[PDB]
Amino acid sequence: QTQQLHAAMADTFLEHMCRLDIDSPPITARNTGIICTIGPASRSVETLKEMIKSGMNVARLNFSHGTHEYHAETIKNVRTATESFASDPILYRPVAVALDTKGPEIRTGLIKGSGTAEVELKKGATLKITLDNAYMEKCDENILWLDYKNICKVVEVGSKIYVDDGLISLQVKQKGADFLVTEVENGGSLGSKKGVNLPGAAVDLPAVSEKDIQDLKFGVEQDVDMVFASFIRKASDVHEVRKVLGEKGKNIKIISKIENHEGVRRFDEILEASDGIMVARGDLGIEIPAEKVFLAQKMMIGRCNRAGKPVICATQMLESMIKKPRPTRAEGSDVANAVLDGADCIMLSGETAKGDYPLEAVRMQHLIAREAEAAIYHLQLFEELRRLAPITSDPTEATAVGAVEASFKCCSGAIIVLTKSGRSAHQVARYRPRAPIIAVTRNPQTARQAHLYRGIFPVLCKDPVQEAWAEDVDLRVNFAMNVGKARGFFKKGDVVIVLTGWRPGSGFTNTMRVVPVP
Amino acid sequence: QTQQLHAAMADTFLEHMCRLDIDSPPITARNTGIICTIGPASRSVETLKEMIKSGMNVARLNFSHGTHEYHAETIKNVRTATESFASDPILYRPVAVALDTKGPEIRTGATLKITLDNAYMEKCDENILWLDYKNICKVVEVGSKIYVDDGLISLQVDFLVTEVENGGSLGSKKGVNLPGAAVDLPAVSEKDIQDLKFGVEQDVDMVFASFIRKASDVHEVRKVLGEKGKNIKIISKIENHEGVRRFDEILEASDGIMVARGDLGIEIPAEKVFLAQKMMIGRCNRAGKPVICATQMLESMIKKPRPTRAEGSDVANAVLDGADCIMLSGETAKGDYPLEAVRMQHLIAREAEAAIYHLQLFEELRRLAPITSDPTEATAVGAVEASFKCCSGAIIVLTKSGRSAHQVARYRPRAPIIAVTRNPQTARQAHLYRGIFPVLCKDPVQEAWAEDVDLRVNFAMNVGKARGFFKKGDVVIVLTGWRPGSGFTNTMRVVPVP
Amino acid sequence: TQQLHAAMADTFLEHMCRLDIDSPPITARNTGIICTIGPASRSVETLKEMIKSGMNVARLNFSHGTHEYHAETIKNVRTATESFASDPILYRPVAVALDTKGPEIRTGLIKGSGTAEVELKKGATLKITLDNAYMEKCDENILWLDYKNICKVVEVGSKIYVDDGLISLQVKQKGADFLVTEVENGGSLGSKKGVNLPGAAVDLPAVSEKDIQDLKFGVEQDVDMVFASFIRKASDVHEVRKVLGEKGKNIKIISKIENHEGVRRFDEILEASDGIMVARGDLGIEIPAEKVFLAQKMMIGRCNRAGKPVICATQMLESMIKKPRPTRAEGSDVANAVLDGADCIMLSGETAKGDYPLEAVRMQHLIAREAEAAIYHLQLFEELRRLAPITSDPTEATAVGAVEASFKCCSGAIIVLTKSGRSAHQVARYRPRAPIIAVTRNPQTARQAHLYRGIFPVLCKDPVQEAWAEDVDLRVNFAMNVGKARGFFKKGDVVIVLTGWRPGSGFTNTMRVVPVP
Amino acid sequence: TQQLHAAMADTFLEHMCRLDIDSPPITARNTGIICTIGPASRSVETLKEMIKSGMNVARLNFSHGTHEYHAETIKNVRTATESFASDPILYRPVAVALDTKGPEIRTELKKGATLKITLDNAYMEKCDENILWLDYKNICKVVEVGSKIYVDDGLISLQVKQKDFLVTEVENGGSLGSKKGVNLPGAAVDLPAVSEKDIQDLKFGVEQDVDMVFASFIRKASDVHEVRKVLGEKGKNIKIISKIENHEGVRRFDEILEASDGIMVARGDLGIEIPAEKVFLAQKMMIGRCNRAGKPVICATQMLESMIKKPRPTRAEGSDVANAVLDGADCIMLSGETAKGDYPLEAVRMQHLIAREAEAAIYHLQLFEELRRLAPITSDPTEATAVGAVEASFKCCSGAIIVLTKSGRSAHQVARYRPRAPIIAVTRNPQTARQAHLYRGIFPVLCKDPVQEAWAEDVDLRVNFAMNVGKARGFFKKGDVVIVLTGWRPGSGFTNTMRVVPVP
């Protein structure tokens, strides 16, 4: 009658679908992490507190724009909002900070010297592209400067050039030395500093530009939790970011953004090298035909679920909400289906960065994800995850799968996991329990980074280390108990699964207990 | 390396997903019917010609607005466009006409009082709101919610006392929705009665009947359509809680279903619409009755030449869910890019159809398939099993009424179902079913029936060769019957293409 | 090894295709072997070899023998079993089972002799009498039997079967105190042979005066279980339960299903019983012989589904009464009982009176071990978990997690500390591949555990240590030492360990994955 | 009826749970019964009863008996069989199978004693406690120190300790005799594919027009190829069934199967060569691989052994028969039970009764799902038509699948998908009719009606003959739905048409 449990018990997926029930309400816990891009509509301490209350788990900073001073202040503000709740550790919600790199972008110049000016473009008309910096702030209906120095070499005649999220389409007629002449194949308003794509072209910008170097250094100085690396093409790109981050940034997670055809093709090597993946559908759906994006998304989510590495679904998930308080039916569907596909996290960009309804957008992602989570066909999912798993003598892995089996058997209210590094909780998440995973840690970075994983609710235990280690273990379990009760995941006398190890330190998780809530 | 054949052979759905390949191009055939709403953007004969070339299969006329004269001219223009291709039956594509009814409506005329007092009819303001639904008090209790102007405003409860739960600009003659209520307005309005007669007179192929709440609303629509309209398909629009809850009885009485998501997401929480969509698609798939996914599928294309990433995903996921048809409303009625919208649904649908996990899907449709002594059903399942076993280029079905080809479609073959018919209405109505590619044979009835049967099979061979579904020497499946007339399909053959 | 290539197959057909005669099984054998004890196997000396050969349960057939005789058999089984108690690592618990006579029909003596036989010829006449003057004067013309009411339950046309159904008779005339019959299947007729009336509704009591005395004797002798013969319905089981009473309340009642009504009323019988015997001997006389595999598979499935022990019995290695090795059908029967899901398999004449009792035990051991490895655990465990219920019981949740974990790491064993056996029973019901080493201090728990597939019971003799954590470890390390000594695993393998959070029954909640020291 | 409650279960466990002794099977029994003919069964009058009791194939064991003797058996088989010929509606074809002697090795022993094996022909007539002569000249090349040697159907076990001779130690002792059979477990025995006697016997089989050969001691594909060569052009249509009898045969099973027309699981000899506890693994592997390949497989040896002396079988025997069928065996077999026993007719009837019960208890839902999943997409029309027919047969629970066939092949292709419905294979070819018995579910009927002058009418006459057969034998009745398979032109290789038709 609740949590789509009648659908959960179907012997076929068709029957599962037939039993999906709009009158079967979900549980409290939402498992899929929500990443919100911060910008002018959401960077105030005031709004950020409401973002957090509304379900934001990760704050994304887009380094395609803005100065270090600006990003430093956003980061300061996220931390002020986040620590405003720290006085009761039981109700404190950790919040991660993500740096999203500019990476190898092509950008246009300023329309008539203004960052906000635009010119309407009639379809069929003519337009000159120039690399002459003379016109870098004098773009208009007739001449359009962009910043890719090498553009003329990697494009031939008849090549297609796309501007502003692929919405403006241009065809190369004649090649010059510092220029291109083009006809507006598809028209609309042209604005300032818009993204440009050359889908037919072997673009040769570096993996990690000088600007990216400076930004990644700022990321280390600012103690960011993860980097979302733009336009990753191959494993060596990932290795370059990892080496750039170097020793000071060794614990920073690298999520590779797959946004072009080469990244999809070389996906397996990229995943191996990365800490996680973002399906960056914006650019991806300009670089490859828009009608193939769902194939790429489902392939990458599947391969990440198979590897146990976090995957993020991104871009235009609730786009209409930039201007409207409720989303379109396609948007509702997109969010639900990302969760049903297996995505660990879902993302907001303009919806939270600049839109008129940032909070409504976060709340809608929260609502849809929780409904979709209840609609998952765990019976087949869990069977297939168990089947496809390399079978190993690893005792931590055996403990994790037993816990998840145990949690299904008793419909547990949670799987409580003590973890220093997060790994033990990550191992549970990989097997996709219905039960929320309460990951208890003293490590603040573990607690923030754990939001990358479906089902993990990180809680940051601030209690002092007790002299007797068994009493210290029991202290943290009890903390987890108090957190679940306060958030309404479970109540006195419900059963929960508890995972602990046999000695202190990382790598010893080997003990699964089935315990009633006190 | 074509048609996601690699992913097709996976032992698990997870491995199927992992094998999906953006570099594995689909075959030419696109199976999912595309329904386009016609309006100022798309109504001229020349544009309609291009709409058909772009992939429109069904022209939807929204009777919520427009005169009979207007709609009659729209239908005439659809038919001029469609018949401009009639000279070559091998390439001719039938186009269906669908009449989507206005249906029963509630219309208007902090703290706010709702009054039914018709002296307050033209005296609407911030203290007094008049409504035209006299039974509203029977249907709503204390605490019930009331939405105004397609959801824009929110309220809580021969008079009603209400606090305004979500404010806005309140206008004249606005739509009202009563979430969770058993609305007892008649199954059909006065206008609807007249529009349905017009539909019959104009020889429309199907009716999309609005705001269907129970089996008896369907029976009423059926009764209005009457004997002259007995062959017109009734597709029930499920738009509110009651229709979802009483889905099984509606489905049994209907020819098929529309998941009317626009109205559904005003009536039920927006975050639950996907549940209702997936339930209805699965139940229609289990019954073998056509289901249409509707509303905002490519909505940004009203203004823009490319869709959003969520819209791309929505179309694909509707197809993967099992929807027989996908629909366009404003995108084709009013938008700046109608042709591009139709083309994008075609491209996505075709990719999605190749990505289907047929191995589990057919296995489950088998398992849930009732054992009956019906010969046509046994022949259909055999033909679909045979088509997977030999990777046939098509399944060719001779059909008078469509039913034989519908029975094949419900088992969801990968191979296109070429439904050869001499009945023009059957050829139009067949677009409602996933996988059916209808062809209208215009050749005279040969004196020897055996030869007239072979003439039609050979017609289907010429269509597939011309359209690039298969070539000489490929194997196709062919369904025929033991005598003339409907109901006798019992013969499945594996035949080389000549 | 262990048919692990076959185990990994994604279909049953492919699993079959991968079964490999060159993939040796593990040392552990999970299916209990029940051996009927008689003159071939009763001496302490021979009982010691029975135990070493793999016997887990000694069955005593109360269809024959006096209480004085059966008390001596029990004493001998206990003396043989305790001869191994000096080394607790190699001690094997052995259960004692009492199989009731029940409502049997028996013929009299051929010409005053226990061994004499006469030949009955097809078509000849044979008169059945109830007159006790002929009780010891049966011959080819006159056959006495002890069912006084037989004339009221048969008609003309009725068939009457004698001697494991090998001799058959058709009633030509009903008299008042007799029946005139015609021989259909002839053969050698001996003394005191079992009789079946498949058509008839036999009205002998489910629990006779003699059965009552025998069940009271079972209680007094501390038997582990009772196999109740000819159970027809739930109330029959309740009559046995009533006789065992409060004092016999921990004795397991295994209902023997050996007639048509027992099969028909199976579900109510199982609900009332602690387990089932597929008593195939009488069963294949009471119903058509070609239907017995149907009843066997039905009963084994229903028992596996209910989580109740089920025993496959009768003629499994029959030829081995006379020969040192079995027929191919017999080889197949034993393997297929195990593949069906039988917790235990049984030997009757093979061990009671045959010439090769030790060989018959060894052979059941060898075949069962091979069959166990060949089980398709992938589908079995998936179905057991689906068909089980989602429940608020924390011990069930831990049991199913311990089994799942055992598959993931291909554990050497699941080690379970248990007082009453229930926690190890809960693991067994999920059919892990890993042997379940059940460590108990309770002697009866230890013996009765043999009724569950996969459980290797070990009886801990060490006194309770004051420090409970240390007492837990003591028993876990004892299990480790048994596993190494029996070759189940070696140092550095991984095993699953199940304990509770405190001492006493009913707290099993802790699963650990630990290396073998 | 027909365990149809059990047939609908969603799991195998629930399928087991619903098996019902009071759910009676249909009339049709699908599993062929192969009966060894000998003193007990060889008279024309007994052979008539054997046919009426369920015999489909008469096996002749050429390990003993003269060509004259066997010729007379064959003659009697055909006399009994043709006595039913007057009514083709009711006529049951009976096949004749020739089972070869095959290669052999021939020659009180105390446990722990030392015994020398000599190939020194000196001691041909002088074996004893200390020296034992063998006729296998290459024995030393195929055995190692530590190799086992079994003597006389496994009674005696020797182990090699030093390798023209071998010094062995007795491991399992017993009474040694003259001319006792020898087996070499795990060895690659290099004896010829066929003995000189086998070659003569195989040519006699061609003379006598036998339907199939059961070739003894098949170890490798080349063994099958040599049997095929001996049968030659005149014998090219005779089915070769390889008897798998030892470790090498089991290990080289894939190549043997590909080269053969089918397999016998030769459990008697296999349980001498390999540990008896492992024989069930060998059987289940070979039956599984035969099902996957669509080739007939026979289960043999001791299936109803106790019935040589008794009129009812043991419970283990009943179980073995039912389990061979549930394993997927196309045929089951009787040896001494029919050749020499006191109850030949009862043994045949009991295999009939068990088989039919077990066929109803099959879990077709999972079985059919897996066969399709493991069966390649190919462009072959007959295969596609065949799978379509079986699917259609399940969807309407048809009374039969009627298949016209010249060679048998179209019917064989249906049989591999394991329908519940009997497959009535209508042919004009008498050898095809007899050979069809090798395949689970095929009831071959031999049509003797004149060829009609319109080919489509001649097709229809054969379809209606099958209808009369099913009606006459109680498989179905007027108004039942049956599946019919035919082709688009005459001659083999063109079956492509599936129709669902009411029985007239």
Tab-separated table of C-alpha atoms in Angstrom, chain C residues 148-371:
chain	number	residue	atom	x	y	z
C	148	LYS	CA	-10.439	-58.897	11.469
C	149	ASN	CA	-12.618	-56.302	9.639
C	150	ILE	CA	-11.351	-57.013	6.095
C	151	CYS	CA	-14.635	-58.476	4.828
C	152	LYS	CA	-16.525	-55.234	5.523
C	153	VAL	CA	-14.066	-53.049	3.547
C	154	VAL	CA	-13.695	-55.190	0.386
C	155	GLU	CA	-16.124	-56.191	-2.394
C	156	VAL	CA	-16.084	-58.672	-5.303
C	157	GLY	CA	-13.541	-57.323	-7.843
C	158	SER	CA	-11.278	-55.924	-5.089
C	159	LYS	CA	-7.533	-56.359	-5.380
C	160	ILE	CA	-5.431	-57.474	-2.422
C	161	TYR	CA	-1.632	-57.152	-2.504
C	162	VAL	CA	0.828	-59.289	-0.547
C	163	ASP	CA	4.592	-58.978	-0.004
C	164	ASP	CA	5.646	-55.474	-1.188
C	165	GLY	CA	2.865	-55.732	-3.725
C	166	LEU	CA	4.515	-58.570	-5.651
C	167	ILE	CA	1.659	-61.042	-5.177
C	168	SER	CA	-1.815	-59.905	-6.165
C	169	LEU	CA	-5.219	-61.429	-5.612
C	170	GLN	CA	-8.727	-60.622	-6.845
C	171	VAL	CA	-11.732	-61.250	-4.530
C	172	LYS	CA	-14.131	-63.626	-6.313
C	173	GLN	CA	-16.509	-64.216	-3.330
C	174	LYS	CA	-17.190	-62.319	-0.101
C	175	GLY	CA	-18.145	-64.570	2.800
C	176	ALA	CA	-18.893	-63.713	6.420
C	177	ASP	CA	-15.497	-64.654	7.876
C	178	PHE	CA	-13.589	-65.146	4.633
C	179	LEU	CA	-12.862	-64.258	1.014
C	180	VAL	CA	-12.345	-66.644	-1.913
C	181	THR	CA	-9.773	-65.131	-4.302
C	182	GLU	CA	-8.062	-65.719	-7.604
C	183	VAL	CA	-4.284	-65.288	-7.989
C	184	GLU	CA	-3.343	-62.679	-10.644
C	185	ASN	CA	0.400	-62.255	-9.982
C	186	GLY	CA	1.757	-65.454	-8.466
C	187	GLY	CA	5.127	-66.167	-6.913
C	188	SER	CA	6.618	-67.389	-3.667
C	189	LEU	CA	4.426	-66.749	-0.655
C	190	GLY	CA	6.224	-66.488	2.684
C	191	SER	CA	5.231	-65.940	6.292
C	192	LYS	CA	4.077	-62.709	8.014
C	193	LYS	CA	4.052	-60.605	4.851
C	194	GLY	CA	2.620	-57.102	4.558
C	195	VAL	CA	-0.795	-56.719	2.950
C	196	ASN	CA	-2.322	-53.722	1.148
C	197	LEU	CA	-5.924	-52.976	0.231
C	198	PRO	CA	-5.570	-50.059	-2.239
C	199	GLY	CA	-9.268	-49.850	-3.141
C	200	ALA	CA	-10.447	-50.176	0.437
C	201	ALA	CA	-10.872	-47.707	3.299
C	202	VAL	CA	-9.017	-49.574	6.033
C	203	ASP	CA	-10.465	-48.778	9.503
C	204	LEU	CA	-7.526	-49.743	11.714
C	205	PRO	CA	-6.637	-47.073	14.250
C	206	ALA	CA	-3.993	-44.473	13.342
C	207	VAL	CA	-2.473	-45.080	16.787
C	208	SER	CA	-3.162	-48.588	18.196
C	209	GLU	CA	-2.594	-49.864	21.748
C	210	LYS	CA	0.773	-51.206	20.675
C	211	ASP	CA	1.754	-47.858	19.042
C	212	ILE	CA	0.832	-46.023	22.253
C	213	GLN	CA	3.076	-48.340	24.259
C	214	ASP	CA	5.908	-47.883	21.749
C	215	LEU	CA	5.657	-44.091	21.710
C	216	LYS	CA	5.720	-44.057	25.537
C	217	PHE	CA	8.815	-46.275	25.284
C	218	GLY	CA	10.354	-43.754	22.866
C	219	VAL	CA	9.819	-40.944	25.408
C	220	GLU	CA	11.381	-43.053	28.184
C	221	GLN	CA	14.379	-43.909	25.928
C	222	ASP	CA	15.019	-40.265	24.928
C	223	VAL	CA	14.579	-40.821	21.181
C	224	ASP	CA	15.152	-37.831	18.889
C	225	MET	CA	12.318	-38.435	16.507
C	226	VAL	CA	9.455	-40.620	15.599
C	227	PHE	CA	8.577	-41.708	12.104
C	228	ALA	CA	4.832	-42.236	12.322
C	229	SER	CA	3.692	-44.860	9.780
C	230	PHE	CA	0.502	-44.487	7.600
C	231	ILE	CA	-0.514	-40.907	8.561
C	232	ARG	CA	-3.824	-40.256	6.735
C	233	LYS	CA	-4.793	-36.817	8.136
C	234	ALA	CA	-3.917	-34.052	10.607
C	235	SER	CA	-5.800	-35.689	13.510
C	236	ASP	CA	-3.588	-38.823	13.182
C	237	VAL	CA	-0.570	-36.618	13.811
C	238	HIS	CA	-2.323	-34.933	16.739
C	239	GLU	CA	-3.033	-38.397	18.232
C	240	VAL	CA	0.780	-39.149	18.085
C	241	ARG	CA	1.639	-35.716	19.528
C	242	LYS	CA	-0.876	-36.289	22.368
C	243	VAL	CA	0.770	-39.638	23.287
C	244	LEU	CA	4.300	-38.197	23.388
C	245	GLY	CA	2.757	-35.463	25.587
C	246	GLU	CA	4.503	-32.637	27.450
C	247	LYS	CA	7.386	-34.943	28.412
C	248	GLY	CA	7.953	-35.860	24.705
C	249	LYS	CA	7.280	-32.363	23.432
C	250	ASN	CA	10.756	-31.791	22.000
C	251	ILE	CA	10.657	-35.075	20.058
C	252	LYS	CA	10.277	-34.497	16.302
C	253	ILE	CA	7.305	-36.144	14.603
C	254	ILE	CA	8.039	-37.088	10.978
C	255	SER	CA	4.819	-38.128	9.237
C	256	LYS	CA	5.207	-41.026	6.797
C	257	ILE	CA	3.080	-40.501	3.672
C	258	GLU	CA	2.335	-43.933	2.259
C	259	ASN	CA	-1.238	-43.942	1.017
C	260	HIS	CA	-3.624	-41.997	-1.232
C	261	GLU	CA	-5.367	-40.149	1.579
C	262	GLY	CA	-1.993	-38.999	3.041
C	263	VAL	CA	-1.136	-37.424	-0.333
C	264	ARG	CA	-4.618	-35.879	-0.669
C	265	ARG	CA	-4.486	-34.409	2.833
C	266	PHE	CA	-0.790	-33.565	2.615
C	267	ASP	CA	-1.031	-29.865	3.483
C	268	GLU	CA	-2.924	-30.333	6.819
C	269	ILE	CA	-0.504	-33.213	7.641
C	270	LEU	CA	2.594	-31.097	7.004
C	271	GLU	CA	1.181	-28.167	9.032
C	272	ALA	CA	0.728	-30.533	12.027
C	273	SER	CA	4.096	-32.335	11.622
C	274	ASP	CA	7.695	-31.352	12.146
C	275	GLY	CA	8.667	-33.127	8.885
C	276	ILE	CA	7.744	-35.713	6.239
C	277	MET	CA	8.887	-39.084	4.991
C	278	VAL	CA	8.185	-40.010	1.433
C	279	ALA	CA	7.574	-43.666	2.382
C	280	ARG	CA	7.813	-44.940	-1.160
C	281	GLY	CA	7.364	-48.652	-0.464
C	282	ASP	CA	3.777	-48.733	0.661
C	283	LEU	CA	3.087	-45.594	-1.372
C	284	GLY	CA	3.914	-47.388	-4.660
C	285	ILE	CA	1.472	-50.186	-3.765
C	286	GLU	CA	-1.388	-47.931	-2.578
C	287	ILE	CA	-1.143	-45.722	-5.678
C	288	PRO	CA	0.065	-46.704	-9.182
C	289	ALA	CA	3.825	-47.175	-9.207
C	290	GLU	CA	4.240	-44.763	-12.122
C	291	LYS	CA	2.762	-41.930	-10.008
C	292	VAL	CA	5.187	-42.199	-7.095
C	293	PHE	CA	7.794	-39.767	-8.561
C	294	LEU	CA	4.946	-37.200	-8.796
C	295	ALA	CA	4.059	-37.575	-5.136
C	296	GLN	CA	7.767	-37.515	-4.156
C	297	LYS	CA	8.523	-34.338	-6.028
C	298	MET	CA	5.323	-32.656	-4.815
C	299	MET	CA	6.096	-33.527	-1.181
C	300	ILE	CA	9.731	-32.520	-1.350
C	301	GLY	CA	8.783	-29.165	-3.009
C	302	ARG	CA	6.046	-28.452	-0.414
C	303	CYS	CA	8.455	-29.322	2.434
C	304	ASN	CA	11.280	-27.166	0.994
C	305	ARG	CA	8.722	-24.316	0.601
C	306	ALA	CA	7.534	-24.779	4.254
C	307	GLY	CA	11.098	-25.154	5.510
C	308	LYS	CA	10.341	-28.578	7.028
C	309	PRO	CA	12.640	-31.599	6.772
C	310	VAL	CA	11.783	-34.245	4.224
C	311	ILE	CA	13.209	-37.778	3.919
C	312	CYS	CA	13.269	-39.923	0.782
C	313	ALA	CA	12.927	-43.584	1.634
C	314	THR	CA	12.724	-47.133	0.428
C	315	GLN	CA	14.599	-49.204	-2.153
C	316	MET	CA	17.184	-46.486	-2.929
C	317	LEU	CA	20.001	-49.067	-3.147
C	318	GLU	CA	17.894	-52.216	-2.979
C	319	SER	CA	20.137	-54.540	-5.072
C	320	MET	CA	22.875	-53.916	-2.590
C	321	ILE	CA	21.073	-56.279	-0.120
C	322	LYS	CA	22.767	-59.008	-2.250
C	323	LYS	CA	25.495	-57.207	-4.286
C	324	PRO	CA	28.475	-55.042	-3.405
C	325	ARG	CA	27.566	-52.298	-5.881
C	326	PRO	CA	24.277	-50.765	-7.041
C	327	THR	CA	22.357	-50.669	-10.303
C	328	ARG	CA	22.439	-47.575	-12.491
C	329	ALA	CA	18.797	-46.811	-11.615
C	330	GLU	CA	19.749	-46.843	-7.941
C	331	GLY	CA	22.694	-44.491	-8.536
C	332	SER	CA	20.278	-42.187	-10.343
C	333	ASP	CA	17.525	-42.415	-7.640
C	334	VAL	CA	19.874	-41.305	-4.918
C	335	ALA	CA	21.307	-38.412	-6.944
C	336	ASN	CA	17.838	-37.309	-8.014
C	337	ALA	CA	16.448	-37.358	-4.437
C	338	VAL	CA	19.187	-34.896	-3.492
C	339	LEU	CA	18.522	-32.751	-6.613
C	340	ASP	CA	14.789	-32.742	-5.847
C	341	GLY	CA	15.639	-31.216	-2.410
C	342	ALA	CA	15.482	-34.159	0.046
C	343	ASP	CA	17.072	-33.219	3.389
C	344	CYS	CA	17.764	-36.887	4.159
C	345	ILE	CA	17.894	-40.180	2.294
C	346	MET	CA	17.320	-43.567	3.913
C	347	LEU	CA	18.423	-47.191	3.810
C	348	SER	CA	16.111	-50.024	4.980
C	349	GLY	CA	16.986	-53.720	4.213
C	350	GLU	CA	20.279	-52.505	2.751
C	351	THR	CA	21.511	-51.814	6.288
C	352	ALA	CA	19.047	-53.890	8.391
C	353	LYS	CA	19.612	-57.354	6.904
C	354	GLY	CA	21.776	-57.079	3.805
C	355	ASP	CA	25.239	-58.453	3.044
C	356	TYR	CA	26.834	-55.091	2.288
C	357	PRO	CA	25.594	-52.531	4.834
C	358	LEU	CA	28.845	-50.556	5.031
C	359	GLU	CA	29.080	-50.358	1.259
C	360	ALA	CA	25.476	-49.131	1.026
C	361	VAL	CA	26.171	-46.273	3.486
C	362	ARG	CA	29.441	-45.311	1.681
C	363	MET	CA	27.669	-45.290	-1.675
C	364	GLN	CA	24.870	-42.975	-0.435
C	365	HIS	CA	27.604	-40.728	0.926
C	366	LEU	CA	29.504	-40.698	-2.399
C	367	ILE	CA	26.460	-40.094	-4.630
C	368	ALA	CA	24.938	-37.386	-2.334
C	369	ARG	CA	28.152	-35.397	-2.241
C	370	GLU	CA	28.296	-35.428	-6.045
C	371	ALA	CA	24.632	-34.463	-6.380
